[PDB]
Amino acid sequence: MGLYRKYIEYPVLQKILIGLILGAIVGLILGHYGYAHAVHTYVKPFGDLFVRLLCMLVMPIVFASLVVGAASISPARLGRVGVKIVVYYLLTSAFAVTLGIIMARLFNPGAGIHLAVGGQQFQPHQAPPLVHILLDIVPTNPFGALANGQVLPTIFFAIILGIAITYLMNSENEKVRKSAETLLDAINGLAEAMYKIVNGVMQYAPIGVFALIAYVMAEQGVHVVGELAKVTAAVYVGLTLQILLVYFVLLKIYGIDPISFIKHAKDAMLTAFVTRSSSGTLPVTMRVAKEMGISEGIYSFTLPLGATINMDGTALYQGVATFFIANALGSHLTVGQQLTIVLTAVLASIGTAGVPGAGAIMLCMVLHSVGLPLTDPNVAAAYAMILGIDAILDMGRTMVNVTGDLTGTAIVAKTEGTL
């Protein structure tokens, strides 16, 4: 048990990258020599276990993180600064997923990965009428929506349960207040326990990434490298345009100098790049906000709220990844299930943890809400090749996630300081 401690205390990012490179080389070598069935028999279950462990964690996170998230965005406890930062956060997340859809429309990520995983194509499901679609957001049974997949009734019930808990917590009864407090504390404990299971699965993640993309290279060939490079280029160009366009325009409007802002926020942005965590970058972010002249009463509230709510990079990555997974199956996302991406990726970026590798878990919610279930072997085959390169996108994802919080704190402090 010495080698186990040698394996655990190694850096996780350098473990996943040398799992990825070794998986690519071993998969291409074994696929050139005709051993594409040996990898499917022996190596592929170790990646199937990784995909299964990531898909286990979806529904408790979607319930509990959205309960404790709507408990902080609730209008019963939201002041005057809080309404401004909530409006900023939701509008920037919606523009992030819109820019991700645009950048996944300019590039064509996945067109060329025509998937016939059992000899069959992917048949899209027929949609109900819009009245029945809007009426099935309200469940007839919330326990039945939790026991089945049904993420869209679960989101609605979680949001209204959190808002009702916050309306309970400022009651005039002591028993009612204590009961609402311990219910919210139990749901928050479940939400933190699932994040610990995410942190535990991300230690197994190098072997899973190896076993996934070795089979991807041996089965699907060599052009998947050139097709995943298009996804990486689309995500990084989308994040660069997100930062430049959105944050530089919103800082030039409110009189902030963006160049000095970036030169002040560099120490938080590089830490969010190399650590891939917004929760571990929060002391550096608060120190950077202290060094920018922002008063303590602003960034002592806007930054810990923004570390779990405002994730622009996760919403952009989920838009680009949903378009990639839909293009790999040959489907064409119609208008109407393309606005569902805009709503559901904002809700997923709210529900995302803030630990390394948590956006690929909430991508399953956006895939389920459109009509691409991961029980289908074609969707589960297209999800593996976007799960394999998640550690490359997670760094820029977390960097833009932290930069959005710093931009919102600067803008709202500039608006508040006029008095």
Next chain:
Amino acid sequence: MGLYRKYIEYPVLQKILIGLILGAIVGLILGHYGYAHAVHTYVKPFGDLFVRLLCMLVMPIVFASLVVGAASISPARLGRVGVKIVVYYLLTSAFAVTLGIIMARLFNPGAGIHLAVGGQQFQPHQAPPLVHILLDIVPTNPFGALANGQVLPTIFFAIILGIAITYLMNSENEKVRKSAETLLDAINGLAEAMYKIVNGVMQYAPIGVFALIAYVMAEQGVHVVGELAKVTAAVYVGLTLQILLVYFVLLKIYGIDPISFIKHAKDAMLTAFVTRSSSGTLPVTMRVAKEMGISEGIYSFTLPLGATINMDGTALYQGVATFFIANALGSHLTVGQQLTIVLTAVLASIGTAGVPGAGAIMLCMVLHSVGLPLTDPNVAAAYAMILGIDAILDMGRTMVNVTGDLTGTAIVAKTEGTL
């Protein structure tokens, strides 16, 4: 967002009544001119959303309110006064639902509303033998009974869980006692959060009542007014006979003067009529009980327990409404599923909240336990016309609910004061 605050702070009862009258006039006018399909296309989803929001709240209330209700009726914490008021409360609720069945037998509410909502009638389900019916009260899986509809296993598991929690809370172990305390507090927090969601849905309720009974008048015609007047007459004659017969006989037996009792309890009865809430009428009820000479050690315990347990008017309304919904489909309730109404409406009146509009939610439990599921379009069509006039019956419902508590406090204080 000024008009939203104009809409919210308006009185809710005067909102629902002017939604109801406008819905009746607009539905009759648009149904006379042949526009019965335009209302079904455009107005009816706004009432379907209201029925769906009320049917969402059934199973968490049925679980949690019955857990925290059986935690207060439990024989591990019930003293000598408590056994007497529990016996009084259960016997008066059983006589209330029996009198509701009698008053819905004398009048014929719903005979004339022959429903053919899809060209088909309502086919009653074939019952199993009585041994299997009694054996399916105990579930093989309580989570499976919660995930499906299955209200009768859920009631049994909730009652025995509350009794086991109360037997845990007087243990000799500190850890066991603290764990039982926080489990009961979390379940009570869920039970209060669902009541807050009820209070939130009852603000949308004017638009829902409008959209429901406009389609009811346009589709089914003009004689539905004369058929709902029979239901209103049956409910109010049943409540008058409940008060007069049951409470005046039980007060004449125990030496109380009923005329002076009514003249003392008028200030609580009128408040329960106009506010439609037993929880908001509790300070007035305790003040009225203080003005009747009742000692503090009696009404400080019997009245807050009676505000959530003893609901005679809700049980009578649920009996009359179940007979109306069964008569509207053409079915005839056999003996055996007519005693199931007597048991299940008592359990529903225990599980009812005490907020305005909470008996129509627990009517779904009595409808499910008989064999009338609300997934059937005929039952969902017959439930809408009894949901539309709920604010007319809720006032007398709450009045009799408060009068039963005051009668029980007077009777048990008269029995205790002989020592």
Next chain:
Amino acid sequence: MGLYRKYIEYPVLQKILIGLILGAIVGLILGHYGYAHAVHTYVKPFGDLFVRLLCMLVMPIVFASLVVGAASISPARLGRVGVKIVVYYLLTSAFAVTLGIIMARLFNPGAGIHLAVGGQQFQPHQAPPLVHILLDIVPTNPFGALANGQVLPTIFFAIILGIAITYLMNSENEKVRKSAETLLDAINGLAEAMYKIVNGVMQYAPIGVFALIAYVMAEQGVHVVGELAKVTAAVYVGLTLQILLVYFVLLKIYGIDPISFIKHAKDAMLTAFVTRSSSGTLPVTMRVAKEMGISEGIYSFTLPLGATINMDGTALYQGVATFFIANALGSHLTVGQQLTIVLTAVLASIGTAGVPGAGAIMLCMVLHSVGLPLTDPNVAAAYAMILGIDAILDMGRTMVNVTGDLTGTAIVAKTEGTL
């Protein structure tokens, strides 16, 4: 209600034994005279209710007791003594279920009870491949695994949830620590409430044992006495060999004298025999460990942990009972579903309560994890005759359960005292 208090305060073991003897005599007498259908109509539902009440309690116990059990075996809070006693406990439970399989292989319990309960035999289910079997331990939805039967995903999710809770409880955040504390306290409250429901069902248990084995004797005949005597002999010879072989060899290795150990532990072993409870024998066990010279810092930690984790007799009884139930249906347990017994009976002995009659509830988990569901009428008929004689096996079961704790405390104190 005087006769109810006469019935309750009677000793439960002497109630179950005189229910058993009367059931055997009445069943044989009524089966000799051809009245085997009258007992099936009138007496058999009172035993079906007992089996249903015991099968209700399976899934909440399997979830909550394993969460709070893995929260105590967790490596985040396990010291140096704790690793040694955990290794001892798990290895002794595995050897206990292995010895139970051996003793149920030497004897042939159930061969001669060929069951054709509806004219049909028992058809064994076809197993999936080993990769899919190992991959279905991780659920795609934990709420879906709880709502269905699915005990093997529930065990995995419960264990990792408990380990994540213990990794949360030593965090640096106050809110996270308090939330993990109240979540673990709520789950522990549920786990204690289900044990109170077990203690309540075991008061009805004499009538259930009567109604079960009266129908067993009237239906299946007189040779079932000779076939249950083989199960009793196999269990008691297995427990004697468990004590003698395992504990006397493990005490002779570490320099302890086993004869003086038994002469010191007699006062705890007889109390565990006659009371059938490891939780009620814990003060006597700690007093016996104090009288053996063991230091307070060892037995103040190893014995309350061993009272809920180390159950060798329950694992041996579950191995012998699973082989008996498989032999009664005519099936032959293959290798692979015979190692599943070794894993699952260890997990069931961890999850067992420590109250009288709790191993027959967790036997359902071992039956479900092999491929013998209790919804099948043949398995439900073979489970009743092993449920009828549970009070005979429970005494020696609890005796070996307490003796294992005392042996582990002595061995680990001898290992620690060398410093």
